[PDB]
Structure 1
């Protein structure tokens, strides 16, 4: 009814030289996985990224970005490390929080994946506000043009545009998936930690590009809330959907990121309760209309266990919301739980809706395509 993408205490990765990575799971396995991100290509291939937390579930720990690839509809997976941390600090070196896009970049189908990178910081990234930007931080971008088989680093100007801004201590993708606009523009939702002198600690925004190499920041900022967020393209707006303790928040920009205003069809429509949680938000066509599909946790215990990871439909015209499927109807592991990522595709006449999510330190996959008629009708 499901498959395991990455098995907690059940995977063995190799490093760049081909030596095994001895984690703290049983038998020297990778201990824990978090923060899944997925896409589906024009060939039907599914690629899933996650934080491979070799030693512990903690955010401040030794982490590589794993990638899993399935060509059989999610039944079986081939796995590797896509992005290695710098191996400065055996406790703390890390790459974190993947956000991915599958896109047509000047004719070439490309998977992009963006992760934050730290080495010696022993605290959460929001603690580091003294510098513009933090010297321990980077935001790195990798690509594949071979359907997810190989990844290579992309040289970008992302660090430069953050430095030039001068009011950002660190930036990170919004977690899960970014998007390619109908005109071809690449867009990553972002989270930013502002420098200490800015009265808002966190903001949301996006970065955009034509070629995947040269990126830009818009001039405005959206309120941060819990900062993890996704963007959809709708009706001549970019619309975000942001983590927040309690009710999720959604804003729209009609001027390509200069200004943001509340988006009534999604704002305050789903409750994640205490702490909030990352959620995934995408669009799915229905005729010449769109529906938003959204995944996040109901959090019945009002805590970090983030129970009941659920799929919702948002009617973008009426503002109705309904629960489609509580696809992980379980209490999570409070060491780190609740995150998810959706992926919709129509290849020829075959429509697929997939999800990956956190399940007790593992990453699981489900094919949710049977729900498509219900979601599409919600317009």
Structure 2
């Protein structure tokens, strides 16, 4: 059913040399975890990434990307650091905010994980709009081809395509999971901070690739809102589902990212109340139809506590929405709360629906597979 993936003030990681990472949690533990991202492989293996915010919950702090791996259905976890920050700034060096994909890349089952990287910036990324792109920023990609046991950097052209665009100060994945399309294409939802001269500070889009090495940006942009977002594939559309204060937003592109229009079955269907929150949106088959499963916070206190992280089903045909399970029916820690990531898989005849989420500085896991008949029937 819950397991603890990463325990606030309860984990000890080691660095590249094998020396302990002394955090600010009791006993020198990692203080806080945020921003979970998960996938399930063809082997049934569960891999969960999260920020290991060793000293504090702040975004502007010393952060590595942790990875937890479970081969027993989420009962127990082997943990390590998958991506280390550059160790320039003991206060501020960070790799953060993962987005992951499990994919068959030219036959090879691969886990991709993409994180933003900063070193000396002491402010949030929206503060740095003078350069194309910001010199402190990068966006790095790591892969595993051994079922999540080891990760290695992927050399990409992502920094170059941002520079060539000329109107982007920084870019980040949409947070949680990206996707592999029916044709094989790899797609990461993205968020971007535009250069100062652009009237809109934030936009949403995606990057795409065939091999995981060479990526492309489409020519268009979607409106940013609170910019964290996921994409689903539905007929010859890509459909996003975007954080926004109040009602979540959803747009579709029928021309592979040149133009976006509102997608009625999801647009303004879930309310996250003041400030908004990241949410996870995926598809689940039901016969030759699809249902969208979505997780985000009800936010009953209308603030940064982001209470009641809940699973919804969206009927992609009728536009009906319903609450499936309030799986974290608790007031969150306003230092950083509310985020989640879903993962659905059918391996042979075994269908699984898993979630990970933020829980008072820890990351928890639940097996939500018992809900699948209810979700699938929502067509």
- TM-score normalised by length of structure 1: 1.00
What's the secondary structure of 1:164's corresponding residue?
Answer: helix
TM-superposed CA distance for 1:269, in Å, is 0.1
Separation in structure 2 between the aligned mates of residue 57 and residue 65 of structure 1, nearest angstrom: 14
TM-superposed CA distance for 1:278, in Å, is 0.1
TM-superposed CA distance for 1:183, in Å, is 0.1
Separation in structure 2 between the aligned mates of residue 21 and residue 165 of structure 1, nearest angstrom: 38
Alignment correspondent of 1:70: 70
Separation in structure 2 between the aligned mates of residue 20 and residue 55 of structure 1, nearest angstrom: 14
TM-superposed CA distance for 1:211, in Å, is 0.1
TM-superposed CA distance for 1:110, in Å, is 0.1
TM-superposed CA distance for 1:206, in Å, is 0.1
Deviations 1:202-235 (A, max 9, x none): 0000000000000000000000000000000002
TM-superposed CA distance for 1:113, in Å, is 0.1
Separation in structure 2 between the aligned mates of residue 274 and residue 146 of structure 1, nearest angstrom: 42
Separation in structure 2 between the aligned mates of residue 283 and residue 235 of structure 1, nearest angstrom: 12
Separation in structure 2 between the aligned mates of residue 103 and residue 3 of structure 1, nearest angstrom: 26
Deviations 1:104-126 (A, max 9, x none): 00000000000000000000011
- Give the alignment of 1:122-201 within 5 angstroms: 122-201=122-201
2:245 equivalent to 1:266: no
Deviations 1:93-138 (A, max 9, x none): 0001000000000000000000000000000011100000000000
What's the secondary structure of 1:163's corresponding residue?
Answer: helix
Deviations 1:156-194 (A, max 9, x none): 000000000000000000000000000000000000000
TM-superposed CA distance for 1:349, in Å, is 0.2
Deviations 1:288-323 (A, max 9, x none): 000000000000000000000000000000000000
Separation in structure 1 between the aligned mates of residue 192 and residue 262 of structure 2, nearest angstrom: 19
Separation in structure 2 between the aligned mates of residue 168 and residue 249 of structure 1, nearest angstrom: 22
Alignment correspondent of 2:2: 2
Separation in structure 1 between the aligned mates of residue 180 and residue 338 of structure 2, nearest angstrom: 26
Separation in structure 1 between the aligned mates of residue 40 and residue 126 of structure 2, nearest angstrom: 32
Please provide the CA RMSD for this pair: 0.3
Separation in structure 2 between the aligned mates of residue 79 and residue 254 of structure 1, nearest angstrom: 41
TM-superposed CA distance for 1:236, in Å, is 1.4
**Runs of 4+ more than 2 Å apart:** none
TM-superposed CA distance for 1:261, in Å, is 0.1
TM-superposed CA distance for 1:139, in Å, is 0.1
What's the secondary structure of 2:325's corresponding residue?
Answer: strand
TM-superposed CA distance for 1:346, in Å, is 0.1
Deviations 1:76-109 (A, max 9, x none): 0000000000000000000010000000000000
TM-superposed CA distance for 1:256, in Å, is 0.1
Separation in structure 1 between the aligned mates of residue 127 and residue 267 of structure 2, nearest angstrom: 28
What's the secondary structure of 1:264's corresponding residue?
Answer: coil
Separation in structure 2 between the aligned mates of residue 272 and residue 184 of structure 1, nearest angstrom: 33
Separation in structure 1 between the aligned mates of residue 277 and residue 129 of structure 2, nearest angstrom: 23
Separation in structure 1 between the aligned mates of residue 123 and residue 269 of structure 2, nearest angstrom: 32
Separation in structure 2 between the aligned mates of residue 107 and residue 262 of structure 1, nearest angstrom: 35
Separation in structure 2 between the aligned mates of residue 360 and residue 374 of structure 1, nearest angstrom: 29
**Equivalent residues, number:** 379
